[PDB]
Amino acid sequence: HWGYGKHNGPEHWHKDFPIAKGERQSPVDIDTHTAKYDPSLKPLSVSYDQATSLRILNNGHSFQVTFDDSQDKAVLKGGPLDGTYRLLQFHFHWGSLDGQGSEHTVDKKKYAAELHLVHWNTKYGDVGKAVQQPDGLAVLGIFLKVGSAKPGLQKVVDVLDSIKTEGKSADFTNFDPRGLLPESLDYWTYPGSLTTPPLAECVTWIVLKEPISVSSEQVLKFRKLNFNGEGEPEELMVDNWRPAQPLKNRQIKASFK
Ligand SMILES: Cc1ccc(NC(=O)NCCS(=O)(=O)Nc2ccc(S(N)(=O)=O)cc2)cc1
Numbered sequence: 136h137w138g139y140g141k142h143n144g145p146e147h148w149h150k151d152f153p154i155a156k157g158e159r160q161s162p163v164d165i166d167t168h169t170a171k172y173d174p175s176l177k178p179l180s181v182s183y184d185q186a187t188s189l190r191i192l193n194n195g196h197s198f199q200v201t202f203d204d205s206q207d208k209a210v211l212k213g214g215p216l217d218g219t220y221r222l223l224q225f226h227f228h229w230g231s232l233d234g235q236g237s238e239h240t241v242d243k244k245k246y247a248a249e250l251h252l253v254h255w256n257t258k259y260g261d262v263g264k265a266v267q268q269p270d271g272l273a274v275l276g277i278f279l280k281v282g283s284a285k286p287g288l289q290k291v292v293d294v295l296d297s298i299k300t301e302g303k304s305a306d307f308t309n310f311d312p313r314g315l316l317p318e319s320l321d322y323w324t325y326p327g328s329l330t331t332p333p334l335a336e337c338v339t340w341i342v343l344k345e346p347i348s349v350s351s352e353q354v355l356k357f358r359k360l361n362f363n364g365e366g367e368p369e370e371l372m373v374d375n376w377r378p379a380q381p382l383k384n385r386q387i388k389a390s391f392k
């Protein structure tokens with residue numbers, strides 16, 4: 136089964152998921168000098184005031200917080216998007232060292248981690264159907280750098296020892312994802328894919344320019360999670376990121392001058 140190790144990592148994925156070598160794979164390097172400002176882009180509309188978080192889960196490759204998406208409670212709209220996209224969950228990708236861990240890069244710069252807020256297009260009814268569509272998902276990607284603590288992340292980090300190993304979950308209600316956002320909503324956007332198997336080419340990527348800063352203590356608690364399940368040999372959950380993929384016939388657009 137797939138993972139991030141030498142023997143099952145991103146260079147192996149194409150054998151089970153041949154779309155790994157497709158025409159719109161993610162992540163990519165964002166070359167800020169080649170991305171074009173697009174004045175027809177709208178401001179993003181991030182409407183999370185009614186978000187209802189449910190559980191936090193170690194899924195063996197990352198940790199994820201799930202939300203109630205049975206209703207338009209936490210939606211992403213505007214920007215490059217048509218229609219309404221409901222928040223399903225967020226998760227992160229991070230490194231073993233502060234100089235790596237993000238999936239997208241900016242002029243080849245790697246950040247310590249990357250937050251993905253995963254949304255699906257309500258015109259498709261459910262996420263499983265959305266992932267079969269070229270405009271089925273919108274993932275809001277936010278870079279993390281190490282510096283000052285992010286207060287809105289602390290509740291997440293404090294529960295991670297209760298989901299150390301694969302398959303563990305915990306109640307994680309009343310969490311406000313607005314506390315994970317940077318000040319600016321300026322973004323880059325491009326058509327891409329899931330960055331993990333099945334690597335489906337169903338994602339409008341919206342990557343914010345402004346990183347959030349997290350403390351060294353916060354990211355160290357990410358690095359204490361385990362890929363393995365309870366009672367198995369401990370492999371620390373670090374470097375769960377896919378490297379940048381060929382841009383091919385795509386143009387990255389910027390919402391800002
Ligand atoms: C390190 C890591 C992190 C998350 C995962 N998988 C999941 O969370 N799956 C459940 C939600 S899903 O919508 O069904 N699939 C999905 C997969 C990837 C992305 S991404 N990384 O492009 O934003 C977005 C959505 C695997 C490894």
Ligand SMILES: [Zn+2]
Pocket residue numbers: 226227228251330
């Ligand atoms: Zn992700």
